[PDB]
Amino acid sequence: ANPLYQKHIISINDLSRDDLNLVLATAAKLKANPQPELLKHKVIASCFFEASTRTRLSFETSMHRLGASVVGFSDSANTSLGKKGETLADTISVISTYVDAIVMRHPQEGAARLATEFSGNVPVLNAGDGSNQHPTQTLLDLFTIQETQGRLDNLHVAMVGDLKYGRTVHSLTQALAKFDGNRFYFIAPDALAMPQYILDMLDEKGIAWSLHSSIEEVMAEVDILYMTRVQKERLDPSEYANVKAQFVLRASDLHNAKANMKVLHPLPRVDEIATDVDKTPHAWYFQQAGNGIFARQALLALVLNRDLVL
């Protein structure tokens, strides 16, 4: 019985180190020799209570690449019920009597956590859950840093944009901290600051980090440049402006970044990485996307299977 067998992928902390490699080890294999029949007869529910087309497509495409059928939907306001009676607890209990894997997304933190205690013996993968977690994306990001660089310990990972509310950064930073040597450069506006928790832990584990004014001071130092969208919505039009110009990445700036230096971004990029960037080999956010098809493939593939010549 492989480890990740029958286990619900609810959050990044319940995944150890060994855990992530066995996820990273798989996908690297399915990217090489893919198993198109390995999840046949499997029906999967893709339940997007919050709408997320880009994650939905990757997730369902991933299922299809392994043989499962898929059924699902988008938004409760685009479902039969919600506020009109039906409870989460009950929808899951029902649905949990058709399909073999519920993958859901949610406007609230914990829906995933909770569905896992209703789903019965059905494993439940978290496509999203409010300000909380987002396993697959991160499981992926790592797998993309591992591929590009060849390693997950001892890195010069710099994060940039909205470190504060940034759901994906807080997830990646915790996973990287499960590994050794990494150093983290932090370059975000004073308001969109990396929260203290991550920090505090960053130093429980005695991990090297440091705050920075711009990417000018680190451009070379770094290996991986995880970019993130800032938000006028988070700021105020006039506020947004005075600092936005402090965090746009032009192709010019990559100017003298190491040959191995890569640029990442959960997408939708929209101001930050300007278009002239894409022509540089340092550009790798699309290459990163095409990888979640393997990221997620691995998961589904591990969750429902026991043995694999993978």
Partner 1 sequence: MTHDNKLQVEAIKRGTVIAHIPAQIGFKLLSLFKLTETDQRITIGLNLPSGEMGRKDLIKIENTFLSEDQVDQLALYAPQATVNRIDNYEVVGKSRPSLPERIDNVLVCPNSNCISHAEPVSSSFAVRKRANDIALKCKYCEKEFSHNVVLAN
Site for partner 1 in 237-266 (CB under 8 A): 237-238, 240-242, 244-245
Told to judge if 156 belongs to the known catalytic residues of this protein, a careful annotator would answer: no
Instruction: Indicate the residue among 45 and 219 with the shorter CB distance to a second copy.
Output: 45
The number of angstroms, rounded, from the C-alpha of 265 to the middle of its chain's C-alpha atoms is 10
The reply on whether position 231 binds partner 1 by CB under 8 A is: no
Binding a second copy (rule: CB under 8 A), the pick from 18, 191, 205, 214 is 191
* Phi, psi angles (nearest 5°) of residue 224: -120, 125
Told to judge if 134 belongs to the known catalytic residues of this protein, a careful annotator would answer: yes
Q: Which stretch binds a second copy (CB under 8 A): 16-24, 153-161, 170-178, 287-295?
A: 287-295
Told to judge if 54 belongs to the known catalytic residues of this protein, a careful annotator would answer: yes
Told to judge if 55 belongs to the known catalytic residues of this protein, a careful annotator would answer: yes
Please report how close the Cβ of residue 214 comes to a second copy at its closest, in angstroms: 20
The reply on whether position 289 binds a second copy by CB under 8 A is: yes
Provide CB contacts within 8 A for 114, sequence distance 6+. Answer: 88, 89
Cα radius of gyration rounded to whole Å, the chain = 20
The DSSP call for residue 195 is: P
Nearest to 193 by CA among 237, 235, 135, 222: 235
Longest dimension (CA), the chain: 59
Site for a second copy in 236-255 (CB under 8 A): 236-238
Please give the Cα distance from 290 to 177 (Å, whole number).
Answer: 25
Nearest to 114 by CA among 7, 5, 10: 10
The reply on whether position 197 binds a second copy by CB under 8 A is: no
Please report how close the Cβ of residue 85 comes to a second copy at its closest, in angstroms: 4
Residues designated catalytic? 54-55, 84, 105, 134
Question: Binding site for carbamoyl phosphate: residue ranges?
Answer: 54-55, 105, 134, 137, 267-268
